Structure formats: C-alpha cells, structure tokens
Amino acid sequence: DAMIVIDGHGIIQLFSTAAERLFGWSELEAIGQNVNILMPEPDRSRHDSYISRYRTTSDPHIIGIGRIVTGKRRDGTTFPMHLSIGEMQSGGEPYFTGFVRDLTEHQQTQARLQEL
Numbered sequence: 001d002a003m004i005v006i007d008g009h010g011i012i013q014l015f016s017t018a019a020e021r022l023f024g025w026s027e028l029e030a031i032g033q034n035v036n037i038l039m040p041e042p043d044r045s046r047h048d049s050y051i052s053r054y055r056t057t058s059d060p061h062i063i064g065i066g067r068i069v070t071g072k073r074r075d076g077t078t079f080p081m082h083l084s085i086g087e088m089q090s091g092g093e094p095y096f097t098g099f100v101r102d103l104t105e106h107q108q109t110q111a112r113l114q115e116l
C-alpha cells in the first residue's frame with residue numbers, strides 16, 4: 001500500500017518500495033529526511049509541532065483515528081491519501097508508522113461523475 005516509519009523527531013527511518021513508487025523518492029533519498037518533505041504548506045511547517053504536541057499531551061488527533069490528507073510528490077504534484085498512524089517503541093524510543101492509501105482514482109471518478 002505504502003509504508004513509512006519515523007522516529008519521534010519525524011525523521012524517516014524506513015521507506016517501503018510502494019512508498020518509492022507513490023512519492024517518487026528512493027529509499028536512500030528519503031531516509032534521514034524529515035517526513036514533512038512529503039506534505040505541502042502549511043502542514044509541512046507545522047508537522048514537527050504536531051509531533052511535539054502529541055508527545056507532551058498524549059492526546060491523539062490522528063493516531064488510531066485515521067484521516068484523509070493531501071500528500072505531495074517529488075515532482076511537486078499533490079494528491080489525496082488516507083493515512084493511519086501507529087505508535088510503537090524500540091530501544092526505549094517511540095516510532096511512528098504511517099500506512100498510506102492513495103485516493104487519487106476515487107477523487108477523479110467522483111469529480112468526473114459530478115462534472116457530468
């Protein structure tokens with residue numbers, strides 16, 4: 001589907017093959033980058049605080065809720081995707097995993113039916 005693992009600072013730790021196809025970064029390019037490289041403004045500039053905020057408050061806004069958001073490709077094109085976040089820990093540090101479902105086709109079908 002598309003899978004991404006980040007550390008508690010938002011740095012990409014793992015980047016699945018499907019993720020590469022979906023976003024247009026290669027694994028090496030992507031690893032060691034902030035996850036925000038995947039989103040547009042204003043979310044890009046806020047994502048760190050989203051993360052900071054959750055770590056302190058421990059109130060989920062998307063964790064085990066899911067949400068549809070706009071994702072951003074390497075070539076600058078944006079698209080809708082469903083996102084679910086999981087919390088994990090390893091070596092005492094927290095890790096987040098995101099499962100992505102590309103909603104591009106659903107949106108286009110819907111737009112196209114509306115337009116007709």
Ligand code: HEM
Nearest residue numbers: 004006038039043050051054060061062063069096097098
């Ligand atoms: C690529 C496009 C993404 C966008 C546009 C996005 C957007 C957001 C937004 C809007 C929030 C805050 C929700 C709120 O305050 O109401 C948030 C929180 C968060 N995001 Fe993302 N996200 C993206 C990808 C990811 C990925 C791939 C991960 C992890 C692998 C991730 C990890 C988190 C975490 C850990 C939080 C705080 C958790 C929570 O509040 O439940 N994000 N993100």
